[PDB]
């Protein structure tokens, strides 16, 4: 009943065709826009098809609530941050209620400490570092 027939596309033409079955727009980076694909696909279960294709092709993706950002796997960055007067548990309770909690890329660190470690897509790390440093100045 549906489906895309790919003949040598460029992964930005392709993933925008899936942006109707997924209910959010897709934003693919320019280093991940050089890989190509052919084949007959079928969008009947896209949240498992995007997950299977991102591991066969080699990709990382993040959905914050409005759009789906797609980077290639060689752009993953990491950072360690320390909180002076707040622990890890209230920041993780902030992300669970704010909807920014991603179970594929959680926060690695001690449960009552200031120092922890984070790694993922460049829109997730740049949000987590700025939100972590914007609570200590308020406190």
């Amino acid at each position: 009943g549906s489906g895309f027939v790919a003949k040598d596309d460029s992964l930005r033409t392709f993933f925008d065709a899936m942006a109707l079955q997924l209910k959010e727009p897709v934003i693919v980076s320019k280093m991940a826009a050089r890989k190509k694909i052919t084949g007959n696909f079928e969008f009947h279960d896209p949240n498992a098809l995007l997950e299977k294709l991102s591991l066969q092709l080699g990709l990382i993706w993040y959905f914050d609530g409005q759009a789906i950002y797609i980077y290639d796997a060689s752009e993953m960055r990491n950072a360690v941050v320390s909180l002076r007067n707040v622990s890890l548990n209230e920041f993780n309770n902030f992300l669970k209620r704010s909807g920014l909690y991603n179970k594929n890329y959680p926060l690695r660190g001690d449960n009552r400490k200031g120092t922890f470690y984070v790694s993922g897509p460049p829109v997730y790390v740049d949000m987590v570092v700025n939100a972590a440093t914007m609570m200590d100045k308020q406190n």
Partner: peptide, 27 residues
């Protein structure tokens, strides 16, 4: 179609027509 190509065979089979080009054939 697979002479100088690298490919994966089995259930999830595909043919890499180039280092940056995948081909998922019909099941």
């Amino acid at each position: 179609w697979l002479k100088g190509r690298s490919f994966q065979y089995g259930a999830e089979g595909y043919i890499k027509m180039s280092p940056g080009h995948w081909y998922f054939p019909s099941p």
